[PDB]
């Protein structure tokens, strides 16, 4: 019951200017107030220890923004979030230079995180064995396929031990055997009491991966709860949206857009 | 006052990381070349040759200066220019170009331009060594007065970085500065003792008095005094030393304050 | 029964040099023969009219190479392929400039394909309506999410009418409602007798999208046939691979790698 | 022989596409600047000012040439240099930088550098216009001899493209050429009548005879004759015209042949 991540009233706004030249107007004299877009609004989150939490929602709901805020690459406009450990985030396109080869990419990544060269050379064989790259580890990364790049990035991130791990649709390109291996690794990490966040648009993978569900609709948390409770509501909402006619769908999207934008 | 201490602590803590990242960038920028890292020594040398054929053979009719042949007089003064120009030109675009790859990564953002500058300093050092080795064929041998380089070689570095830390931030807020920099540096090149020496006592006397405010003047003259002229440069020109130290301190303070004030809102601007 | 695409003995090799400096050795004097990797080897394909063909295989099998060869961005080393129409390919990361906005990207793409400005302005509203982008069509593309970018690219490609359409895992980022809309569009295109190739690692989407299956294993076509015949074999192979121990999996991968590489 | 016809047909068929792509690239490269496309006129002008302060005021003591003030003599000759330099420098990296985004796309690969050059020609034209407008304040008014520009302005263009079509392919095969180009162009700048005029009848007589082989000499002298000197340039120097036409034809033939021979194997090299 160790509180891993706590989020209290996190809110994020973005300033929208139709013209590129309007950026300087509000930067030199503070009297200007333009239109703003609420990417997030009053999100409260409590992630305990040994939990797999899956974020669900339609495109543009604000899952990547929340994942980046948890990771630390973004700063909330209002509110604070505290983490009891070190976090690492994997995305659909991780940091891998196309010109560099696999070994150069590995040493670059582990140098940015702050590992000595002897530690890098000691940890390299584990990455090599987990990636199943073979000869192609010596070839340039640009020669890799998408699944091979995903495997290399996932192995690099997994080999170092993070307290909190975030996966943001990274497994979509990987095949089924890689998914099973990642599932075994996730079970081991759960045994090690790490906290894992999983984002995917494949509902079967979410069902077989996650244990708690957070539903985000238009930047607001519609529902947080157990898998068996929240997931059926999301599926029923998807079927109901499929039932609706085109005009009703357009009206619903327009209502969400009206709610999200405000002039202040 | 807190910004200066914060930036100094960030730079002191990540010295070895800066060195390693500079060493990696040197390899990255010389990836597909067949010669490799040799171009870092080949690209400036050719330029020097051109500058000797135009301003040395064509103009001046190959006349010596101060009892020294013009070739070595130009060789000593031209060494730092490539490093300074390249560092200032590439450090202004360091944050803008490489923001997304480092926004996710967790290291201080104030050390990003610095190692960029450190990617060029290496090459400069190499060239400098060769110049000294090239100076022994005339009859100029190293003396005690060369120890002055221990004060002079670092200062140039501390100048270039002090500029970039400012011009990077000013580059994010306004994109036109990267176009203005190319115009400024040319003025800093031709109005310098790198290629010519003013005569004074006329319309060039005002030019001579105005050229002393250029920091390149001090660096070139100090290098020549240390290597060629066998003279303690700081005994006669300590006022220039103090003025340049003040300039460097002012640049560092303004750059640190501006970088710390606008650090949070980088994504909205870029 | 109109033969849409015909492929007869398509074979693709890649030259592998461990050192970057060995490229010039075989380019100036033709006596050098280095190691080569068979990305494809003796592929024969017959795609008729009104067919949905799904490519299946593990990571690194050679599906993207075959899709690019069909599209025309690649040239086979040995063999020829003929197409009765114009083809268009959508990938996991289509051509969209991050600095440009949606409208500038649209006009760039339709200018590269050879459309006059009046035609571009006439066709823009259909793209706007299909993308469901709203105000964000005026914002820069870099502000978009992954699903929004996928929707914009898919709408741009769909609005123009191609004889052959290839989708290479582009729908992985899109949500379920977008998938249903694409399914309806695919039904309409089948009514228009277009030929669609679909590649995805989601087997339910493949089942509900495709009608014929081509299985690629190590650059060689293991089996081509109907969905109900080929798909169960692939699933059984996946389960059998899950059954196997780690050493057996490593041996199988090593055998495939041995088969693919040759010094000639 | 088939390569030349193929390249000519590809360029003739896609003229409007080339123009539109150049117009789009002009907007792309000037995206985040506050002034916009005005920098295409501002960036060269500043350089001219510097070249007037150093070589005009400092050297030559502001002495007129051929009865014309040095300022306009330099203004007429400096106009084409920025276009030529930028086109040759950016066209060498056109295929290497933008291969992946166009490999999937279906348009001829031989027109990729050309519109890159066309992205700069526009700006040159604008500058040229201003120069003529700036020439009326001294008392130099347009005459019939200006119609010669109809032969001379296009030729410069047909020169630059003819170079790039070669240097792009040579850039893909060997990456070091992009580093060598910067060294060559400087030699083409200082050994030209852009800033100075040789005196002959001595050690500069060989320099004068060697400078006639530089194609920039012909372009600068023809522009000055058309605009400043009021003289039919082709009556006295048709040998230079024929020599430059032959040079352009040779460059085009070699570039087309090399581009067509190695077009299929671009992905393996890059
Ligand atoms: C000599 C020279 C003047 C002097 C000049 O022209 N001046 C200035 C005062 C009046 C006098 C004149 O009116 O003739 C100049 O300005 O640029 C030059 C450039 C840009 C030059 O690039 C290359 C040469 C050069 C190189 C080697 C050899 Cl072996 C021979 C030549 C070269 C000479 C001059
Ligand atoms: C004059 C000058 C020589 C001539 C020189 O120095 N020479 C050549 C033969 C011998 C004689 C000497 O030994 O003194 C030179 O070479 O470069 C120069 C550069 C690189 C210069 O940049 C700027 C000026 C300058 C600009 C404006 C004003 Cl108002 C005043 C100055 C300037 C002059 C010279
Ligand atoms: N820098 C930005 N400026 C303005 N709006 C932004 C910016 N970054 C993101 N947005 C918007 O914020 C919203 C949330 O985006 P995002 O969180 O990536 O969607 P998502 O939850 O990841 N859905 P998905 O497409 O499946 O990834 C979208 O409407 C974006 O257009
Ligand atoms: N330019 C290249 N040089 C050498 N090998 C290459 C090159 N391009 C691709 N390959 C290899 O060719 C094989 C086939 O790659 P690819 O076709 O992209 O896999 P795939 O079928 O798409 N599987 P997936 O990862 O799901 O996309 C892989 O082993 C690649 O490493
Ligand atoms: Mg996302
Ligand atoms: Mg692929």
Author numbering:
A (entry chain B), C (entry chain D): 1 to 264
B (entry chain A), D (entry chain C): 1 to 270
Give the published text:
Wall teichoic acid (WTA) is a polyol phosphate polymer that covalently decorates peptidoglycan of gram-positive bacteria, including Staphylococcus aureus. Central to WTA biosynthesis is flipping of lipid-linked precursors across the cell membrane by TarGH, a type V ABC transporter. TarGH is a heterotetramer composed of two TarG polytopic transmembrane domains (TMD) and two TarH nucleotide binding domains (NBD). Like other ABC transporters, TarGH uses the energy derived from the ATP hydrolysis cycle in the NBDs to drive substrate transport across the membrane via the TMDs.
